[PDB]
PDB file of C-alpha atoms in Angstrom:
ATOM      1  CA  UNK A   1      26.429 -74.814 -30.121  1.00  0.00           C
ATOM      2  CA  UNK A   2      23.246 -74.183 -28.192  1.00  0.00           C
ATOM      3  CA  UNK A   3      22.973 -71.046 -25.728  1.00  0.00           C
ATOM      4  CA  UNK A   4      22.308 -71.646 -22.191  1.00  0.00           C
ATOM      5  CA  UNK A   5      21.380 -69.688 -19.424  1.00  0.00           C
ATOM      6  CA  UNK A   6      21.518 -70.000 -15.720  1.00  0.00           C
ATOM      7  CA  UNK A   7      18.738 -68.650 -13.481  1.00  0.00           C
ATOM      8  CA  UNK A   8      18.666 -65.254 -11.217  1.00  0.00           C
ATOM      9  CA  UNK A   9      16.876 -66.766  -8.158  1.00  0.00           C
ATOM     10  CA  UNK A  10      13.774 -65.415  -7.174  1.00  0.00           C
ATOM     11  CA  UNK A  11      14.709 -65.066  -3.124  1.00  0.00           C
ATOM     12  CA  UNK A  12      17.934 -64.801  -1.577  1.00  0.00           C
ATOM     13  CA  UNK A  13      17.007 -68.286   0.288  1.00  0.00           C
ATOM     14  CA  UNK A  14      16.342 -69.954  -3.037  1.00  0.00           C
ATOM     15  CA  UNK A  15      19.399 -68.433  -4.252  1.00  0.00           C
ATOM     16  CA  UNK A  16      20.951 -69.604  -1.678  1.00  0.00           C
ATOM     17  CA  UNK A  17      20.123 -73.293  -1.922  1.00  0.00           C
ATOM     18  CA  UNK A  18      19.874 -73.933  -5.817  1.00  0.00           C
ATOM     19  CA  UNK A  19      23.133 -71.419  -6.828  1.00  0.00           C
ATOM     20  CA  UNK A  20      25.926 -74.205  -6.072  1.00  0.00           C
ATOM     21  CA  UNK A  21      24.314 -76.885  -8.296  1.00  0.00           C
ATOM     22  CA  UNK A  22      23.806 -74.209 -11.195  1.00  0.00           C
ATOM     23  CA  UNK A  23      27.598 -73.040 -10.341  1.00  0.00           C
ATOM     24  CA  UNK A  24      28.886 -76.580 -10.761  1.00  0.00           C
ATOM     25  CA  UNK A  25      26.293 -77.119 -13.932  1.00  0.00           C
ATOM     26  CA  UNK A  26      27.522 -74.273 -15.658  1.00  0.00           C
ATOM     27  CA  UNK A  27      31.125 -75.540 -14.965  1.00  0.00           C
ATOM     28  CA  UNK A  28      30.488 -78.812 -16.397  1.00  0.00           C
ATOM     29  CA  UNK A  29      28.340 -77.331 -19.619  1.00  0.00           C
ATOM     30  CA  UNK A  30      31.765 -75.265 -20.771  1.00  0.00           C
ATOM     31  CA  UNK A  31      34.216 -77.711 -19.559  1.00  0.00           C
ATOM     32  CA  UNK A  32      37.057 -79.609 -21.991  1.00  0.00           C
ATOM     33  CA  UNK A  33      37.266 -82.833 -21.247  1.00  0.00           C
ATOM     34  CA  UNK A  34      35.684 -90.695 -20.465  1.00  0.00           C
ATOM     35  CA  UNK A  35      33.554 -90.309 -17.232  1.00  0.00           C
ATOM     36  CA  UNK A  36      34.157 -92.790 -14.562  1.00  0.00           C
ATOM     37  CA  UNK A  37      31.335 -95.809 -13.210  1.00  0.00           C
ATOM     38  CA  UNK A  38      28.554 -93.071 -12.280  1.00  0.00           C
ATOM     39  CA  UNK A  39      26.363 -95.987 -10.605  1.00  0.00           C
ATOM     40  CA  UNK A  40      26.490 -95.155  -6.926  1.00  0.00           C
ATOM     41  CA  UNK A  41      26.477 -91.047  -6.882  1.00  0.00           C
ATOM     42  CA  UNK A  42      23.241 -91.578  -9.501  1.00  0.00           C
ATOM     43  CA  UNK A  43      21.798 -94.441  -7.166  1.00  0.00           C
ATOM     44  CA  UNK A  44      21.964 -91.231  -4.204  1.00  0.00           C
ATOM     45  CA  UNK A  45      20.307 -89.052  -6.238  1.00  0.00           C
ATOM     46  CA  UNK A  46      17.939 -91.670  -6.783  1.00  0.00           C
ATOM     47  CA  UNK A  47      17.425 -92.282  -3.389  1.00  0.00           C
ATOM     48  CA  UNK A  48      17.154 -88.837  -2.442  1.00  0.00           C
ATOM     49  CA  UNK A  49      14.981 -87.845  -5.368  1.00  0.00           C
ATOM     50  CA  UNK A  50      12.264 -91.178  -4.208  1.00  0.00           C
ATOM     51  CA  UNK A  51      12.404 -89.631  -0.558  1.00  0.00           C
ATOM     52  CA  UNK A  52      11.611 -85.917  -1.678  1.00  0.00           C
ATOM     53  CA  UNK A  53       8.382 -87.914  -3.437  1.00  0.00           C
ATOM     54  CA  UNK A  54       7.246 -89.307  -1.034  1.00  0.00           C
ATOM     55  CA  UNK A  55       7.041 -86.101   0.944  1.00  0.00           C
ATOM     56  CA  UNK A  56       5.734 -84.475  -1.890  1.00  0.00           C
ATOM     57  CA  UNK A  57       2.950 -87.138  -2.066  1.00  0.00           C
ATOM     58  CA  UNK A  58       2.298 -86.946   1.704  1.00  0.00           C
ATOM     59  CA  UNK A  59       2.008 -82.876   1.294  1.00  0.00           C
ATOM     60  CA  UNK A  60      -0.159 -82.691  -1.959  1.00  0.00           C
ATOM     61  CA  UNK A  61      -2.488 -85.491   0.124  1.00  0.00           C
ATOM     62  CA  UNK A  62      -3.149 -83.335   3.133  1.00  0.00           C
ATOM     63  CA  UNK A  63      -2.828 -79.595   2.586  1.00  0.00           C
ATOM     64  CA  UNK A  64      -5.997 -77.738   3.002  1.00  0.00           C
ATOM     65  CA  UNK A  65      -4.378 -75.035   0.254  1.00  0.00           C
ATOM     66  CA  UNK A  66      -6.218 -76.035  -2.821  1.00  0.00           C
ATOM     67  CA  UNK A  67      -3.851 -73.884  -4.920  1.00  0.00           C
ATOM     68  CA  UNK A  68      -0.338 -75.596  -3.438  1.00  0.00           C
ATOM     69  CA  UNK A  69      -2.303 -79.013  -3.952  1.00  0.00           C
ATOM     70  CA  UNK A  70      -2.628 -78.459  -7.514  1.00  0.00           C
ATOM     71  CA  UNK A  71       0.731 -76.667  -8.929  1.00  0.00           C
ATOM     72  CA  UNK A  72       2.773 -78.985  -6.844  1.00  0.00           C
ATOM     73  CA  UNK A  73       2.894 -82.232  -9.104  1.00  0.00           C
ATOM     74  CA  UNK A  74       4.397 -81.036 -12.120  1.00  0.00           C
ATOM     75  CA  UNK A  75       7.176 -79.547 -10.260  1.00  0.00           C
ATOM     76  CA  UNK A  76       7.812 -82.795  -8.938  1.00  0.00           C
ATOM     77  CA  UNK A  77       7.349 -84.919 -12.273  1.00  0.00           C
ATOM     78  CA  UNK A  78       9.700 -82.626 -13.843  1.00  0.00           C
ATOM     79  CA  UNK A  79      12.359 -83.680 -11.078  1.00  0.00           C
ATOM     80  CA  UNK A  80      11.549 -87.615 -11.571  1.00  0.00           C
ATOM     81  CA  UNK A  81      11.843 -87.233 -15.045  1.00  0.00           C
ATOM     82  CA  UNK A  82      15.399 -85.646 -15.289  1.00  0.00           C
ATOM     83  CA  UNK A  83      16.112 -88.213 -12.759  1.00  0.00           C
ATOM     84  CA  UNK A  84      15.489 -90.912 -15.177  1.00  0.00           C
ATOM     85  CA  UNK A  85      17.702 -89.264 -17.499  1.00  0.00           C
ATOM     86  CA  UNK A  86      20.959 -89.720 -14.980  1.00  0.00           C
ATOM     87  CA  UNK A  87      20.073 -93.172 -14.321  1.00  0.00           C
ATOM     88  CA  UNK A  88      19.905 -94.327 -17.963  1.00  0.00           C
ATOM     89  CA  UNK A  89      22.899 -92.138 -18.704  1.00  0.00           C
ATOM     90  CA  UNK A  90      25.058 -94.199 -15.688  1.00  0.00           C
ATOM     91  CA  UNK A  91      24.140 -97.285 -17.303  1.00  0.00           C
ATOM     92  CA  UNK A  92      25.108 -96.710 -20.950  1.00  0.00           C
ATOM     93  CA  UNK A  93      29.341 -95.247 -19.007  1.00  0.00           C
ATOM     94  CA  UNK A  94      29.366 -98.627 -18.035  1.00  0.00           C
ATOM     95  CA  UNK A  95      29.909-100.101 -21.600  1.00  0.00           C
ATOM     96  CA  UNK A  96      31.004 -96.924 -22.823  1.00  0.00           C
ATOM     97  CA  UNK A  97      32.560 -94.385 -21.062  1.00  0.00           C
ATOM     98  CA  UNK A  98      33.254 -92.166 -23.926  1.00  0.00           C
ATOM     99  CA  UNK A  99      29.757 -92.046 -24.031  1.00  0.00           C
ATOM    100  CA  UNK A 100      28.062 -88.592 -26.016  1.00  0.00           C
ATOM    101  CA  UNK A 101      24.328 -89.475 -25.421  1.00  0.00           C
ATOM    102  CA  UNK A 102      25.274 -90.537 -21.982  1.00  0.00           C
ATOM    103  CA  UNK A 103      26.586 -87.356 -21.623  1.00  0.00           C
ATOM    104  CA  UNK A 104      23.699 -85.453 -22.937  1.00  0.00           C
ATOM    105  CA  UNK A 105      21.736 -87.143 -20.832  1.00  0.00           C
ATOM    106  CA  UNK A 106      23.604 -86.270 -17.725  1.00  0.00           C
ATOM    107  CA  UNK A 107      23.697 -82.421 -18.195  1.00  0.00           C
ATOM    108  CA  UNK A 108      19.757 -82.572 -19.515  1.00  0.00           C
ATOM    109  CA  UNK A 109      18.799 -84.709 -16.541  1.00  0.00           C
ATOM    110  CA  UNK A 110      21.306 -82.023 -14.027  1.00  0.00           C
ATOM    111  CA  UNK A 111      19.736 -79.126 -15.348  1.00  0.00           C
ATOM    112  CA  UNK A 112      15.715 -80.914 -15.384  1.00  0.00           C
ATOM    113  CA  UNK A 113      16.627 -81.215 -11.530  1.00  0.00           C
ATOM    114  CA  UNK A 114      17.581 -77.674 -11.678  1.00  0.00           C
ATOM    115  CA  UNK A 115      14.695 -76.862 -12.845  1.00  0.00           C
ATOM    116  CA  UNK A 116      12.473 -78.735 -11.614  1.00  0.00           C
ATOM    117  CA  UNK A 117      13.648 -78.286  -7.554  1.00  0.00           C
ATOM    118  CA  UNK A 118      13.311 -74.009  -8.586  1.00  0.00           C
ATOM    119  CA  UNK A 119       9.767 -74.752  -9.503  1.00  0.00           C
ATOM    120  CA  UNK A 120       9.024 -76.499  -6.426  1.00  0.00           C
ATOM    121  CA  UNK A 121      10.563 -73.832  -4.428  1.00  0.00           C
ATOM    122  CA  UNK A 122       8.543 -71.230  -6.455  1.00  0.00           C
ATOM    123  CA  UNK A 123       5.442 -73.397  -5.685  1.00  0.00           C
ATOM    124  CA  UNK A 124       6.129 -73.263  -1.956  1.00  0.00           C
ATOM    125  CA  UNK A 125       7.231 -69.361  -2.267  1.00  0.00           C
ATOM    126  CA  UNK A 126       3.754 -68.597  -3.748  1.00  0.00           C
ATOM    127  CA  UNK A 127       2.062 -69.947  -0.752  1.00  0.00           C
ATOM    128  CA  UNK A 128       3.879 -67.592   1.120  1.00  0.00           C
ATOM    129  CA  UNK A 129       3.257 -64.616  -0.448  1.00  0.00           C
ATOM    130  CA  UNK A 130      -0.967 -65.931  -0.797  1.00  0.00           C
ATOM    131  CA  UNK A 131      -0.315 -65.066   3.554  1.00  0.00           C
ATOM    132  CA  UNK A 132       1.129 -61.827   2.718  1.00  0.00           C
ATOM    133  CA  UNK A 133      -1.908 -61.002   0.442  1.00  0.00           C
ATOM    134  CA  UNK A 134      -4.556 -62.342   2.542  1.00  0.00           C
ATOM    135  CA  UNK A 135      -3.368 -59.647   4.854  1.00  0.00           C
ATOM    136  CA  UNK A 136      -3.229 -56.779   2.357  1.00  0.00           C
ATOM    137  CA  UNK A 137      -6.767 -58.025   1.135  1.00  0.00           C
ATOM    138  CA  UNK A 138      -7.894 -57.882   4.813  1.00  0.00           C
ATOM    139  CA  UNK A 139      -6.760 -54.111   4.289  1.00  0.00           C
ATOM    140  CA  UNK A 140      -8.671 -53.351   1.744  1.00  0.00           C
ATOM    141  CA  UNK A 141     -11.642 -54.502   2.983  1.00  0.00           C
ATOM    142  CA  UNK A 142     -10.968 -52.480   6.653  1.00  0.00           C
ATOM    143  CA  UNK A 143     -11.150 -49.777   4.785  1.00  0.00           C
ATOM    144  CA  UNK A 144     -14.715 -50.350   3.446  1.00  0.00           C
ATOM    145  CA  UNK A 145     -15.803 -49.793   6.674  1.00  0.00           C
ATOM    146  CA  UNK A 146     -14.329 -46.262   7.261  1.00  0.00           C
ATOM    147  CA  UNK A 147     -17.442 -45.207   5.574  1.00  0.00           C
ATOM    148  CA  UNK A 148     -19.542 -47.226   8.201  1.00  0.00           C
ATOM    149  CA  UNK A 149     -17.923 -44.661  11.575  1.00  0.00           C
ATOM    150  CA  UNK A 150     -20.481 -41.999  12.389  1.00  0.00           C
ATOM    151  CA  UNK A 151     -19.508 -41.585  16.230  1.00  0.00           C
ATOM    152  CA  UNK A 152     -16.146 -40.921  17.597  1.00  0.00           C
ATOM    153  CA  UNK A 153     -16.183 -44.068  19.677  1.00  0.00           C
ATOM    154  CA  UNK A 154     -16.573 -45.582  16.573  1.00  0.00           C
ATOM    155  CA  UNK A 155     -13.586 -43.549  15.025  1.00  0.00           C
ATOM    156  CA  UNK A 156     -11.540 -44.696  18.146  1.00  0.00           C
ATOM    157  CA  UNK A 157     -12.016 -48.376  17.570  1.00  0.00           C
ATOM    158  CA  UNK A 158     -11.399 -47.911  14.052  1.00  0.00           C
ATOM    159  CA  UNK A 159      -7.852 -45.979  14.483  1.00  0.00           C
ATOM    160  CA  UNK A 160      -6.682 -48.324  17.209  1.00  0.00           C
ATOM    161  CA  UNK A 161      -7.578 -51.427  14.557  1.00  0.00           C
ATOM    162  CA  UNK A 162      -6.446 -50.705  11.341  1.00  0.00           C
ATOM    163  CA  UNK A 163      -3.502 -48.828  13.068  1.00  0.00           C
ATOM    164  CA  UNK A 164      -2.297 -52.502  13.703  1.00  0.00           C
ATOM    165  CA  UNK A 165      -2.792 -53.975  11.089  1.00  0.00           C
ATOM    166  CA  UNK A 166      -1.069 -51.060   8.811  1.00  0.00           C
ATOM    167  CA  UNK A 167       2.038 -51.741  10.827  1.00  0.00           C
ATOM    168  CA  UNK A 168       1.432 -55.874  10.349  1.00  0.00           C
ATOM    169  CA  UNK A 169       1.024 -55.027   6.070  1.00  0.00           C
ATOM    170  CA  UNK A 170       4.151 -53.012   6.650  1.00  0.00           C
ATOM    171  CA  UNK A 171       6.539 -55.441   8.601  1.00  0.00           C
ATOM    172  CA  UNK A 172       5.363 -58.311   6.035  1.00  0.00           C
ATOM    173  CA  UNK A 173       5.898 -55.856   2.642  1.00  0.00           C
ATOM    174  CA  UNK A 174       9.285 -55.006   4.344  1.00  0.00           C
ATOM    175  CA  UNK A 175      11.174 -58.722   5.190  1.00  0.00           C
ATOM    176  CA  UNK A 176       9.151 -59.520   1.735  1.00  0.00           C
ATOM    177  CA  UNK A 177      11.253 -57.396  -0.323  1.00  0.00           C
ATOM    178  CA  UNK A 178      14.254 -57.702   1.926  1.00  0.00           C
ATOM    179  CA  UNK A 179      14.375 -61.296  -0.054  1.00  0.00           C
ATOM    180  CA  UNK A 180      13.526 -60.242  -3.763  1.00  0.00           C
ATOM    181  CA  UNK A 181      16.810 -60.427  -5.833  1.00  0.00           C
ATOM    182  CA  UNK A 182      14.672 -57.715  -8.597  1.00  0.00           C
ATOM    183  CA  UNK A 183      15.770 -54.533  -7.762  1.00  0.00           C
ATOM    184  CA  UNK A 184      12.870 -52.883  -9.540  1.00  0.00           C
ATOM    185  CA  UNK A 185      10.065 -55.022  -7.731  1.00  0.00           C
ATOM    186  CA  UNK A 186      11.730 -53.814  -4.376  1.00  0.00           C
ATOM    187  CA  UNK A 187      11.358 -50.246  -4.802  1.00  0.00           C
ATOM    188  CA  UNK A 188       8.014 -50.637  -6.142  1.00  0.00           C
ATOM    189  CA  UNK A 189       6.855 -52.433  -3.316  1.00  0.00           C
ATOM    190  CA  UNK A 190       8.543 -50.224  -0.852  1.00  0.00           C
ATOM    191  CA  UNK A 191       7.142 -47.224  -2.082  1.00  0.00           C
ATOM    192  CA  UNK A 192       3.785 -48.169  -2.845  1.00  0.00           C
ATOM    193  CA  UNK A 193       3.953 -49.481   0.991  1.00  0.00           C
ATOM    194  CA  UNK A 194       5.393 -45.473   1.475  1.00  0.00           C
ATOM    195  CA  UNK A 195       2.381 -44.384   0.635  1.00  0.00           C
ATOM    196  CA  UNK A 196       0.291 -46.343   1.976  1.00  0.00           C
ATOM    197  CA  UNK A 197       1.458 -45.332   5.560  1.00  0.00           C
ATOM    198  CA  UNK A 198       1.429 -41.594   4.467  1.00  0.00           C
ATOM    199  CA  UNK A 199      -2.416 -41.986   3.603  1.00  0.00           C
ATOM    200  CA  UNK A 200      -2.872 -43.441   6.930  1.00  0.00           C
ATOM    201  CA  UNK A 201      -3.299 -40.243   9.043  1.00  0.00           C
ATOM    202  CA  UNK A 202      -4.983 -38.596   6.491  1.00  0.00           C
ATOM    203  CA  UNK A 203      -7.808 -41.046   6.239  1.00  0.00           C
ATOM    204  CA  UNK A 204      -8.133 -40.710   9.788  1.00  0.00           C
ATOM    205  CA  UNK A 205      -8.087 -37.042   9.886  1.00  0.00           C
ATOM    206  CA  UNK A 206     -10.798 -36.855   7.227  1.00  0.00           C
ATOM    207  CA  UNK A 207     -12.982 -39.449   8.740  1.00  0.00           C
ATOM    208  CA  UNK A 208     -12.421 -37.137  12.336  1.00  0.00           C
ATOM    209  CA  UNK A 209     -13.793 -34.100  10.093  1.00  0.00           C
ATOM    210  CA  UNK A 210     -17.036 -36.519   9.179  1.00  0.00           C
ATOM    211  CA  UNK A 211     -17.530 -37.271  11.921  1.00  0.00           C
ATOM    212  CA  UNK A 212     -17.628 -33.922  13.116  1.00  0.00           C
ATOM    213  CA  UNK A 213     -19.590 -32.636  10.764  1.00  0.00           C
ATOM    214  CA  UNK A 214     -22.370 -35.272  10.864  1.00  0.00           C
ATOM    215  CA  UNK A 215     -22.993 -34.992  14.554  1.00  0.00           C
ATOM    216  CA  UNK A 216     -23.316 -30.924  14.488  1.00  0.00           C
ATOM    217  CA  UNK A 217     -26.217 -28.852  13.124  1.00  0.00           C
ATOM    218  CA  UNK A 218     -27.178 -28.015   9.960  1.00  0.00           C
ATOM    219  CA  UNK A 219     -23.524 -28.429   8.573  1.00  0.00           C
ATOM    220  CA  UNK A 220     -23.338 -29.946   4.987  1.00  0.00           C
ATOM    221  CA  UNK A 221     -21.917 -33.652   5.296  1.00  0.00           C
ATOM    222  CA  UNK A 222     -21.158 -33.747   1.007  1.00  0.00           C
ATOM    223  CA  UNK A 223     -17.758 -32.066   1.167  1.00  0.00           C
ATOM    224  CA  UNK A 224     -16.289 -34.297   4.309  1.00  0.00           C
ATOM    225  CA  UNK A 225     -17.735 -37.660   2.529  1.00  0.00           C
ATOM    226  CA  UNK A 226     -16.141 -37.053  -0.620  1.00  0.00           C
ATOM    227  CA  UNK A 227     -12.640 -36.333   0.945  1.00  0.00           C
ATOM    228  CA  UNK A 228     -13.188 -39.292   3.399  1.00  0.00           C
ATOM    229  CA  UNK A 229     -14.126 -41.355  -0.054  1.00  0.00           C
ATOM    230  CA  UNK A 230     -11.028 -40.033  -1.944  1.00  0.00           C
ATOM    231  CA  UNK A 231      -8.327 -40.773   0.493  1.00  0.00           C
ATOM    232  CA  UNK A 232      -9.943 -44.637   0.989  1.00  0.00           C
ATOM    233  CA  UNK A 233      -9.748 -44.675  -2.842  1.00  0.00           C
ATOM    234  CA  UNK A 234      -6.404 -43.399  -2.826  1.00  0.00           C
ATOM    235  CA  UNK A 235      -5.148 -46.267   0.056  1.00  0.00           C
ATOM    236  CA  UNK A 236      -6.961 -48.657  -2.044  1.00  0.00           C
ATOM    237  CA  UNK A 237      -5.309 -48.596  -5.162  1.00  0.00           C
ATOM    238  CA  UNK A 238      -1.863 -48.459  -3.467  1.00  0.00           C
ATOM    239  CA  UNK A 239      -2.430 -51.607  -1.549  1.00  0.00           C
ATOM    240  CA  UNK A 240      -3.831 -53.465  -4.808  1.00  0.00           C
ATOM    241  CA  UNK A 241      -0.519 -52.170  -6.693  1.00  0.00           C
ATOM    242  CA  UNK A 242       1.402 -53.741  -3.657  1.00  0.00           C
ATOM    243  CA  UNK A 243      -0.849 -56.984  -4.210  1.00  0.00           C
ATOM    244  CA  UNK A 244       0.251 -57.144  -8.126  1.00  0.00           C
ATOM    245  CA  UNK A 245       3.683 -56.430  -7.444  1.00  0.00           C
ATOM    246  CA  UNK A 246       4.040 -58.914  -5.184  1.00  0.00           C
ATOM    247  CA  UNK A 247       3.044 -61.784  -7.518  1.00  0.00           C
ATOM    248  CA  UNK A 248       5.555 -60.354 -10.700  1.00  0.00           C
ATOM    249  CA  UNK A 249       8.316 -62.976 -11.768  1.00  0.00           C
ATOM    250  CA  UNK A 250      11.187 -62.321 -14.440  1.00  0.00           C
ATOM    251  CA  UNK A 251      11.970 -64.068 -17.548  1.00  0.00           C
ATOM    252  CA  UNK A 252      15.723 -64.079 -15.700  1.00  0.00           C
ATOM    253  CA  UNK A 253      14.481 -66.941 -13.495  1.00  0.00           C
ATOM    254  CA  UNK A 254      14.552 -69.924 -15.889  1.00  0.00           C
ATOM    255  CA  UNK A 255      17.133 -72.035 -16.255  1.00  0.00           C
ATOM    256  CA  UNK A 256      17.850 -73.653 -19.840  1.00  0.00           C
TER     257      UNK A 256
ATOM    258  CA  UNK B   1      33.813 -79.508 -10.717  1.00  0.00           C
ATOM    259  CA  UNK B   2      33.761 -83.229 -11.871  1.00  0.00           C
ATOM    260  CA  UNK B   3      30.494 -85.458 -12.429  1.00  0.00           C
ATOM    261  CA  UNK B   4      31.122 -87.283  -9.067  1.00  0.00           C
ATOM    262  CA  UNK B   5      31.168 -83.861  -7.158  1.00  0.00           C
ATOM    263  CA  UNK B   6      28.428 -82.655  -9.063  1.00  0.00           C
ATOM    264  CA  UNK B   7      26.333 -85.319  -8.458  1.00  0.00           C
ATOM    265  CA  UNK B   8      26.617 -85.343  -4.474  1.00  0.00           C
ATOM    266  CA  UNK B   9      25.998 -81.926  -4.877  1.00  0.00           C
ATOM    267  CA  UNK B  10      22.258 -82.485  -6.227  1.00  0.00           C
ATOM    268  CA  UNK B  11      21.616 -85.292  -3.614  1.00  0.00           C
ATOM    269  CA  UNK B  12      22.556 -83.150  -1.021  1.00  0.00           C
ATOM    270  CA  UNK B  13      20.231 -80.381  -2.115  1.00  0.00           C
ATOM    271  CA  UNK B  14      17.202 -82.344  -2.928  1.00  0.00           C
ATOM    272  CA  UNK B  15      18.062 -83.712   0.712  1.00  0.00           C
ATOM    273  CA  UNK B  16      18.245 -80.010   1.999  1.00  0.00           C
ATOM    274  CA  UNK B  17      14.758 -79.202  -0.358  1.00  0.00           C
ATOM    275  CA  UNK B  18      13.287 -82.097   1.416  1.00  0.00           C
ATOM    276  CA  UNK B  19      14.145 -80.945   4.443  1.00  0.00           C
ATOM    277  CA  UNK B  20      12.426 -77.498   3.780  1.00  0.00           C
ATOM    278  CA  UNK B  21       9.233 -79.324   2.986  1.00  0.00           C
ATOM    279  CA  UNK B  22       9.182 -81.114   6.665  1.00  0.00           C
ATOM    280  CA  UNK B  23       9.879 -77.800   8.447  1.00  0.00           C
ATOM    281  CA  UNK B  24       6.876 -76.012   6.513  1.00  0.00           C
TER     282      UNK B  24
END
């Protein structure tokens, strides 16, 4: 009588590893149906479960990434504890295979390692997209320097570095939402990232005019600084947009 | 889908999650 519901991935690749065990979860949960000696196949998962641990351990241990270090563990608990479940359920089909709590316990302690593996995944997946934003944030803080170029061999070295690292932001954004399954995440990444480039040669073409204009005579320097300062301000709010979409889940992604 | 097949499944994939992990 309860509802369930089985998860919409948050990458293809995750998708792409968890979707047969929800498949064959799902296919179980609405099944009509005893259930044969389940001792060995719950010893492998045992096994397998006590070597993913270990590596777990060994990770959480020695990474440098403070963040990955911390919201590692309870993805990992979650997965020991379902495992429990299947254990105790194998034992109590060996003295009764028409077992109901053994049962329960077998499709609470599948869908806890459901669960519990898409967290760890997600863990892992957040580390990569902290990469994707350290980039972005070195960005943002590129372009507090455009107000710091006041020669045009300064303006030179400026175009031919953040020109770079535009196209580095851009490649990244771009395989990035190549693997979001959320439609509306996509296109908000892609065209924030749209805009971004657009701005591009317009900062540049400002910051030419400033230059310009600061290094002849008795020209007024207001009117090129505040269109300089506008089209920065303009970059910088579509890169932080790019930052916060990149970080969105969906409700869609639990599994329960 | 049975509980023997389903079970191999999720050893397989914790095995294939592990996996991941010693790539990284």
């Amino acid at each position: 009588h309860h509802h369930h519901h089985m998860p919409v991935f948050h990458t293809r690749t995750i998708e792409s590893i968890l979707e047969p065990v929800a498949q064959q979860i799902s296919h179980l949960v609405i099944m009509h149906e005893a259930i044969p000696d389940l001792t060995a196949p719950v010893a492998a998962v045992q096994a397998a479960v006590s070597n993913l641990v270990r590596v777990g351990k060994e990770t959480v241990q020695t990474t440098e990434d403070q963040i990955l270090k911390r919201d590692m563990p309870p993805a990992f608990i979650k997965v020991e504890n379902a495992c429990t479940k299947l254990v105790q359920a194998a034992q109590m089909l060996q003295s009764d295979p028409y077992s109901v709590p053994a049962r329960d316990y077998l499709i609470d302690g599948s869908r806890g390692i459901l669960s519990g593996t898409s967290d760890l995944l997600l863990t892992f997946d957040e580390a990569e997209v902290r990469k994707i934003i350290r980039v972005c944030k070195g960005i943002l803080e590129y372009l507090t320097v455009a107000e710091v170029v006041e020669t045009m061999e300064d303006l030179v070295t400026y175009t031919k570095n953040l020109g770079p690292g535009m196209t580095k932001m851009a490649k990244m954004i771009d395989e990035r939402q190549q693997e979001l399954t959320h439609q509306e995440h996509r296109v908000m990444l892609v065209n924030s990232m749209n805009t971004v480039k657009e701005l591009l040669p317009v900062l540049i073409s400002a910051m030419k005019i400033f230059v310009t204009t600061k290094n002849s005579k008795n020209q007024g320097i207001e009117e090129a600084l505040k269109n300089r300062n506008f089209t920065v301000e303009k970059m910088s709010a579509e890169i932080n947009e790019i930052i916060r979409v990149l970080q969105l889940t969906s409700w869609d992604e639990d599994a329960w | 889908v049975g509980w023997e097949q389903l079970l191999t499944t999720i050893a397989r994939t914790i095995n294939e999650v592990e996996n991941q992990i010693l790539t990284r």
